[PDB]
Design a binder for this molecule. Structure first.
Ligand code: CLA
Ligand code: CLA
Ligand code: CLA
Ligand code: CLA
Ligand code: CLA
Ligand code: CLA
Ligand code: CLA
Ligand SMILES: CC(=CC=C/C(C)=C/C=C/C=C(C)/C=C/C=C(C)/C=C/C1=C(C)CCCC1(C)C)/C=C/C1=C(C)CCCC1(C)C
Ligand SMILES: CC(=CC=C/C(C)=C/C=C/C=C(C)/C=C/C=C(C)/C=C/C1=C(C)CCCC1(C)C)/C=C/C1=C(C)CCCC1(C)C
Ligand SMILES: CC(=CC=C/C(C)=C/C=C/C=C(C)\C=C\C=C(C)\C=C\C1=C(C)CCCC1(C)C)/C=C/C1=C(C)CCCC1(C)C
Ligand SMILES: CC1=C(C/C=C(\C)CCC[C@H](C)CCC[C@@H](C)CCCC(C)C)C(=O)c2ccccc2C1=O
Ligand SMILES: OC[C@H]1O[C@](CO)(O[C@H]2O[C@H](CO)[C@@H](O)[C@H](O)[C@H]2O)[C@@H](O)[C@@H]1O
Lengths: 730, 84, 176, 160
């Protein structure tokens, strides 16, 4: 370390066994430290006992994400370009069924490459470029081929800002350890100056270049590469060059107008992607705020303020150490970032924001479950990293007697409640279904819980849905339809290939899933809540912050003394959430196809991918493999010899990989030792082993190779199960 | 120019009310809640004079004072004042 | 702050160099030489126009039986005797090292003054133009590029195309 | 050794002071007004295919055309970084010529201004009666900047 510290060598450290705590990787050989090294590679209890750097690394090794997201996207714009189908698909939507990727016909490959639209062999897409891409106030294949290198530009450069940190002799403390302004900036002008800037390049150019696309043409029979300058003459069709107004204000006359916007709500008949005549106004109406907003402020003051009786004395002082944490100001974030992603996953499917979605079924549910697993994979995290706080981050105990020191005060308490909450749920929240089986398999419907047997009567309606689609008669101005076409009141006519959204009815078989979610969302959180709370000390172990937030398990005593910790609460809390999301998905498509998705023809006699089979028959939790899993999936297990086939052909692996997790999840440890030697023996006889003491998995590594597999198994299983029942009918 | 010239002046007016209005409303700050209609410093009535806003609001209503009739149902009567 | 960054053979890279480059000699002067309009013409009838082809891949064999032979003999007794094991003298060997080759065996050696010194003076000559030849040929090997790319009409491959003025190739000069 | 590049509060400003100084005579248009009778406008893309700005300027150009535009700004940029190395100093620049004692003839020295020295001492009668020589010519630079797009067009000078 020790090596040359000094002052006295540019000469870099390539060669001399080890580094990472101090009777380190020792001279003496071993393997464990090769999963060490990668694991905990990023961490901070080592590197130095002194903040300083760390924030000087994380602001750099951050960077290389943007740059990456940036090398990525490029190979997607390039891809969504010269491996074309976008040109072809756009003159010809409702019709196509898009591609970007294609094999090369090496070995078996080609089956994977199967006629997708504007006349070519390839593998489809459920990742709605070709639909952000509607945008292109321009169109052209080589063009995206500029947007593309425009991408690699931001990268190399927005990747030499990461040389232009840590490796360059760095900023320091004040720079972040004065926080005083940060959000001031961020939200004001980027949050703002994007949404803002996005406005300017969202009616300028895009609106017009799909105002007269929503009809016909073949591009360049429209939208030149410059055309949209000073020429405010084509902006003539889509409202005035302000005619006699000057910089809004009022001494304005309308005997017949009101600038672009003229607010919509509903859905283009010919392109139901929601109206764009709005899409400017809403982004404009954003930015303003941010534009005004990012103009606080300088900190404590506002939190150093409102206290009460039982309230939070420490509210006041809610962390000096919120300029001195990270692990704290990351975990907070993840809960939001994360919880603020799966709020996407709704406003999307019950309010499409891109031209051609809904009709495009599979190219926005992929979405609504990809976005859905982040608004969850980022939340258990958002707990883990709080545990990482709760255990260690600060130097000593300087933080004292406050909102927390409070919450903890009760702790065998906040989690005392929550518990019973769950068993109240569960009993009202799952055995509920099991009634049905036991009594519908007993069979007496009189007494089930059907949308019709237990008292509810051919209506759901009177709640709040029915006071949403109907609200354009309040303080409400209006604009034909609602806000989200899926609401109770009025309207039908949505689309001329297939369908899109319509009411979406409820009652029971909507009533009780909606409740299983409760109990599922709740017991998830119990285990993370109590997990992060009891982070450091307890009446099973108090001497219990003494290593780190991991540690395998304290020891055979006290009865059990194993799981405890909170790596592990963030190990069995993943375990749930994989359900939390994995059953919410299961919900949406079985609805969204049992009803909604389906299809018009004469007299628009609606014909769902399934005549609402849901009805009386998800209520039975077998119906959930009678009507689901065994019904759909018949497309997965038919999928051989085709074009997609890579799904069925995954769906066996990964429906294997999962069923390999249990081995990592379910087993001892001096076991594979006791085994690894028999091995090590046979090894020595030929003279072939010892060097680098081969060793079994690091108790908790073992759990690391559970879980992670159990998910990348149990998950892509459906990622396959899905793309295979929306491609092809649906 | 145009009517928008009598509206250049008009822009001047919105902008002005808001700034003028503004210094007073942030002046003796470090205050937060509170004023006279609550806890301790009574001299009641409503009162009389304390300005920013009343004065400005009264002006937006006014600006429509002299351009009145001229823009409206265009010109009528034989000199409404009687004087030559 | 400056790379770390290398070598050591930093000593050997430099002798496929005098290999690569001197060598490009062979192409540089014979080409242009060629001999414009010699009088003229290039015609090779002789072993070549009637005995059923002459070479191509008997070409290589004979062709680099020799290069064969000689390129090997080239670096692998450039010099290095001692020629085995077992502790470090670095290059990745000099496991010849302290012994050149032989303790009083034969005339391993060239030349008096117990070494191999091809005398002291001659930095001249080959420091200059020669590690020139390295440099030179960088840019009239960057001519190889200019000299022909553009696959004289007789083929557009993967049709961008991507605009059009007029042709290109070689013979000397330039429109400009 | 490896080349250098010292950042320190405000190199970025000495070379940023300089960048605009060069751009203050690369301001060009009104510094040398005979330069453009109409040359401020580059005259892009007006093929005998097609078109310029748009309604333009149209009663862009005749031209001084061409190619060999990169090679210039590169090759004479292959000099900007030489009066930046050579006069690091150790002087011998005047390599003179091997023989010939007749080469007293000098020229200047190192020049900044009326030359070798200032020169011809002897002066003042009439002419008669560090950054301001910088400051005012961005107040000449950024001025044509908006004057490229200097239009209200639909309307025009409200002022007037
Ligand atoms: C803003 C977020 C983000 C950031 C910057 C971090 C940063 C950090 N986390 Mg963390 N974390 C996050 C989100 C984040 N986390 C989330 C959402 C969770 C919930 C799962 C966690 C759960 C978590 C735990 C439990 C731990 C950390 C730890 C850490 C620290 C260790 C980093 C390391 O060595 O990489 C670790 C990554 C590897 C070693 C690479 C292995 C990745 C495998 C599992 C592959 C994943 C499957 C994938 C499909 C495989 C690729 C495809 C393949 C099939 C070809 C580091 C400070 C650790 C710590 O000890 O604190 C100091 C602790 O282990 N995190
Ligand atoms: C999105 C992901 C990503 C990003 C941006 C980074 C970024 C970084 N990692 Mg990292 N890492 C990742 C995924 C990522 N990692 C994964 C999945 C693993 C497996 C566990 C690791 C295991 C790992 C280790 C062991 C180390 C790092 C280190 C680093 C840092 C060193 C940069 C450097 O030294 O020269 C950059 C060099 C190049 C660009 C040369 C080209 C090399 C190829 C790969 C391209 C950098 C912050 C080092 C560290 O601690 O820094 C924080 C450390 O040695 N990483
Ligand atoms: C986000 C993605 C990443 C990924 C997963 C891929 C993946 C792929 N690219 Mg790709 N690519 C990327 C970024 C990526 N690219 C970027 C940033 C660029 C810009 C250089 C490219 C430029 C590129 C080209 C030109 C090609 C591919 C091709 C491919 C396919 C083969 C690529 C390969 O490595 O072996 C194979 C494969 C699907 C190949 C393809 O298009 O046909 C199959 C084609 O070779 N890529
Ligand atoms: C713990 C202490 C102290 C006490 C004793 C109370 C007591 C009360 N608060 Mg309260 N409050 C406090 C501190 C306190 N507050 C602090 C510090 C804050 C700021 C953090 C608030 C912010 C607050 C709000 C917004 C409200 C209350 C309300 C109430 C009342 C509930 C309504 C009720 O029972 O009548 C109803 C009885 C019927 C028969 C009908 C109750 C009197 C509620 C209220 O105003 O009354 C409804 C209102 O919800 N409080
Ligand atoms: C699921 C719940 C919840 C959510 C997310 C919403 C969301 C919304 N309601 Mg709403 N509402 C709710 C419960 C909810 N409501 C309940 C319980 C009632 C009565 C018991 C109402 C009675 C109601 C009325 C009368 C109206 C709305 C309207 C709205 C919309 C306008 C946005 C707004 O004013 O605030 C902005 C918030 C953010 C930007 C964040 C928005 C979609 C308005 C509407 O959409 O009519 C066209 C209408 O005014 N709501
Ligand atoms: C006839 C023989 C055959 C043989 C046995 C050799 C042998 C050799 N050639 Mg060689 N060469 C040959 C044909 C041959 N060449 C042909 C047909 C050409 C085309 C004209 C070349 C062009 C060529 C060049 C430019 C160079 C060599 C070099 C070398 C030496 C190192 C080769 C190398 O890269 O390591 C193999 C390493 C791997 C990792 C594989 C080696 C003695 C090089 C040298 O001088 O090194 C001393 C280098 O200068 N050759
Ligand atoms: C990478 C390329 C893509 C392509 C092919 C182009 C091509 C062009 N751009 Mg351009 N541009 C692009 C992306 C692209 N741009 C992007 C992403 C932006 C940022 C939004 C711009 C912003 C931009 C501006 C501001 C301008 C151009 C201009 C031009 C044109 C100069 C035309 C000319 O006659 O030159 C050949 C010249 C001859 C004299 C013949 C040329 C057609 C210029 C233009 O179109 O002028 C009317 C104008 O200056 N572009
Ligand atoms: C520089 C600039 C700018 C700008 C502008 C800008 C600066 C803009 C920006 C914007 C931003 C944005 C717009 C954002 C975006 C984002 C995104 C797009 C993302 C997305 C996502 C999500 C959702 C999550 C994750 C994933 C992803 C990434 C996909 C300018 C400046 C200036 C100056 C000084 C001078 C004068 C002019 C001006 C102009 C005044
Ligand atoms: C059209 C033309 C042309 C030309 C010429 C040319 C013309 C050529 C070219 C060349 C080229 C080069 C040499 C290169 C280039 C490059 C470029 C141009 C690029 C650009 C850009 C942009 C645009 C942006 C971004 C950046 C970049 C750089 C990419 C022609 C026309 C005509 C007519 C009227 C008729 C017939 C005759 C003629 C006379 C023929
Ligand atoms: C047997 C095998 C394999 C298997 C395999 C299986 C049986 C399975 C596997 C699986 C894997 C995986 C599975 C991975 C992956 C992946 C991915 C790429 C994913 C993605 C994703 C995402 C993005 C997230 C979540 C969802 C998903 C999953 C979709 C192999 C074997 C072998 C042999 C004989 C010997 C040599 C080596 C080899 C050649 C190797
Ligand atoms: C199966 C199992 C093992 C045994 C698993 C092992 C030993 C996996 C490690 C195998 C390594 C990854 C093989 C690595 C060898 C190659 C990388 C070397 C050759 C290099 C390539 C070219 C092949 C555990 O150690 C364990 C520990 C704790 C809880 C549960 C379990 C558990 O369930
Ligand atoms: O001798 C220069 C040459 O340019 C002159 C100057 O002599 O002036 C204009 O003409 C050239 C073209 O030759 C332009 O490119 C130059 O930049 C202009 O100032 C013209 O008189 C001469 O032809």
């Amino acid at each position: 370390l020790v090596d040359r510290d000094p002052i006295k060598t540019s000469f870099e450290q390539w060669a001399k066994p080890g580094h990472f705590s101090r009777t380190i990787a020792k001279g003496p050989d071993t393997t464990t430290w090769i999963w060490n090294l990668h694991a905990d590679a990023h961490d901070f209890d080592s590197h130095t006992s002194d903040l300083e750097e760390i924030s000087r690394k994380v602001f750099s090794a951050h960077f290389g994400q943007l740059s990456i997201i940036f090398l990525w996207l490029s190979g997607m714009y390039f891809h969504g370009a010269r491996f074309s189908n976008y040109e072809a698909w756009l003159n010809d939507p409702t019709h196509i069924g898009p591609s970007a990727q294609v094999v090369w016909p090496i070995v078996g490959q080609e089956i994977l490459n199967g006629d997708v639209g504007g006349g070519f062999r390839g593998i489809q897409i459920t990742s709605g470029f070709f639909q952000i891409w509607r945008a292109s106030g321009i169109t052209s294949e080589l063009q995206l081929y500029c947007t593309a290198i425009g991408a690699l530009v931001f990268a190399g450069l927005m990747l030499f800002a990461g040389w232009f940190h840590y490796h360059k002799a760095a900023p320091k403390l004040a720079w972040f350890q004065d926080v005083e302004s940060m959000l001031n900036h961020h939200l004001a002008g980027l949050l703002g100056l994007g949404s803002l800037s996005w406005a300017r390049h969202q009616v300028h150019v895009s609106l017009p270049i799909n105002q007269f696309l929503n009809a016909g043409v073949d591009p360049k029979e429209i939208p030149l590469p410059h055309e949209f300058i000073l020429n405010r003459d084509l902006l003539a069709q889509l409202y005035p060059s302000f005619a006699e107004g000057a910089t809004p204000f009022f001494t304005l006359n309308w005997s017949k107008y009101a600038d672009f916007l003229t607010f919509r709500g509903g859905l283009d008949p010919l392109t139901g992607g929601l109206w764009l005549t709005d899409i400017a106004h809403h982004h404009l109406a954003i930015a303003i705020l941010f534009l005004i907003a990012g103009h606080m402020y300088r900190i404590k003051d506002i939190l150093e303020a409102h206290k009460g009786p039982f309230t939070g004395q420490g509210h006041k002082g809610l962390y000096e150490i919120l300029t001195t944490s990270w692990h704290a100001q990351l975990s907070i974030n993840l809960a939001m970032l994360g919880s603020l992603t799966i709020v996407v996953a709704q406003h999307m499917y019950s309010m499409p924001p891109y031209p051609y979605l809904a009709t495009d079924y599979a190219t926005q549910l992929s979405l609504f479950t990809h976005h859905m697993w982040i608004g969850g994979f980022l939340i258990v995290g958002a707990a883990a990293h709080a545990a990482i706080f709760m255990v260690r981050d600060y130097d000593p105990t300087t933080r004292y007697n406050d909102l927390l020191d409070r919450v903890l005060r009760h702790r065998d308490a906040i989690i005392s409640h929550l518990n019973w909450v769950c068993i109240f749920l569960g009993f009202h929240s799952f055995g509920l279904y099991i009634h049905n089986d036991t009594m519908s398999a007993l069979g007496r419907p009189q007494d089930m819980f059907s949308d019709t047997a237990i008292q509810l009567q051919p209506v759901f309606a009177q709640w709040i849905q029915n006071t949403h689609a109907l609200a354009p008669g309040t303080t409400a101005p209006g604009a034909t339809a609602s806000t989200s076409l899926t609401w109770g009141g009025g309207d039908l006519v949505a689309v001329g290939n297939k369908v899109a959204l319509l009411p979406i009815p409820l009652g029971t078989a909507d009533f009780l899933v909606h409740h299983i979610h409760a109990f599922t969302i709740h017991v998830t959180v119990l285990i993370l809540l109590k997990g992060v709370l009891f982070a450091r000390s307890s009446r099973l172990i108090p001497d219990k912050a003494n290593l780190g937030f991991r540690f395998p398990c304290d020891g055979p005593g006290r009865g059990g003394t194993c799981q405890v910790s909170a790596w592990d609460h963030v190990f069995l809390g993943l375990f749930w959430m994989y359900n939390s999301i994995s059953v919410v998905i299961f919900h949406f498509s079985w609805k969204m196809q049992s009803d909604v998705w389906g299809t018009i023809n004469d007299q628009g006699v609606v014909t769902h991918i399934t005549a609402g089979n849901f009805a009386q028959s998800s209520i039975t939790i077998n119906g959930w493999l009678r009507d689901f899993l065994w019904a759909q999936a018949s497309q997965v297990i038919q999928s051989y010899g085709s074009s997609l086939s890579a799904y069925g052909l995954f769906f066996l692996g990964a429906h294997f990989v999962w069923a390999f997790s249990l081995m990592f999840l379910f087993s001892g440890r001096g076991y594979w030792q006791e085994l690894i030697e028999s091995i090590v023996w046979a090894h020595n006889k030929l003279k072939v082993a010892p060097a680098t003491q081969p060793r079994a998995l690091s108790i908790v590594q073992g759990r690391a190779v559970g879980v992670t597999h159990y998910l990348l198994g149990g998950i892509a299983t459906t990622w396959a199960f899905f793309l295979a029942r929306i491609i092809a009918v649906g | 120019d145009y009517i928008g010239s009598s509206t250049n002046l008009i822009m001047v007016t919105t902008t002005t009310l808001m700034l003028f209005a503004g210094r007073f409303g942030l002046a003796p700050s470090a205050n937060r809640k509170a004023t006279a209609g609550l806890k301790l410093e009574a001299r009641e009535s409503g009162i009389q004079t304390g300005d920013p806003a009343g004065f400005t609001l009264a002006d937006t209503l006014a600006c429509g004072a002299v351009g009145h009739i001229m823009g409206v149902g265009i010109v009528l009567g034989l000199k409404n004042t009687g004087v030559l | 702050s400056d790379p770390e960054s290398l070598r050591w053979n930093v000593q050997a890279e430099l002798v496929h160099s005098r290999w690569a480059m001197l060598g490009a000699a062979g192409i540089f002067i014979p080409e242009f030489l060629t001999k414009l309009g010699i009088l003229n013409t290039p015609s090779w009838y002789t072993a070549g126009e009637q005995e059923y082809f002459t070479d191509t891949t008997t070409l290589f064999i004979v062709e680099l039986v020799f290069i064969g032979w000689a390129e090997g003999r080239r670096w692998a007794d450039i010099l290095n005797p001692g020629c085995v094991n077992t502790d470090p003298i670095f290059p990745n060997n000099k496991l010849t090292g302290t012994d050149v080759g032989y303790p009083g065996g034969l005339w391993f050696d060239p030349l008096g003054w117990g070494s191999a010194s091809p005398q002291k003076l001659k930095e001249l000559r080959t420091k200059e133009i020669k590690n020139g030849r390295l440099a030179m040929l960088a840019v009239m090997g960057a001519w190889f590029q200019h000299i022909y790319t553009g696959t004289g009409p007789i083929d557009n491959l993967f049709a961008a195309h991507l605009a059009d003025p007029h042709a290109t190739i070689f013979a000397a000069f330039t429109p400009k | 050794s490896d080349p250098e590049g010292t950042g320190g509060f405000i190199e970025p400003k000495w070379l940023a002071y300089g960048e605009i100084i060069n751009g203050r005579y690369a301001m060009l248009g009104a510094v040398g007004a005979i330069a453009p009778e109409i040359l401020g406008k580059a005259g892009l893309i007006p093929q005998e295919t097609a078109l310029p700005w748009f309604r333009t300027g149209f009663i862009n150009y005749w031209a001084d055309s061409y190619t060999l535009f990169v090679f210039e700004m590169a090759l004479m940029g292959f000099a900007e970084h030489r009066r930046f190395q050579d006069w690091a100093k150790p002087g011998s620049m005047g390599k003179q010529y091997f023989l010939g004692l007749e080469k007293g003839l000098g020229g200047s020295g190192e020049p900044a201004y009326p030359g070798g020295p200032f020169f011809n001492p002897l002066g003042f009668g009439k002419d008669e009666k560090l950054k301001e020589v910088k400051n005012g010519r961005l107040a000449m630079l950024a001025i044509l900047g908006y004057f490229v797009q200097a239009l209200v067009t639909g309307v025009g000078p409200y002022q007037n």
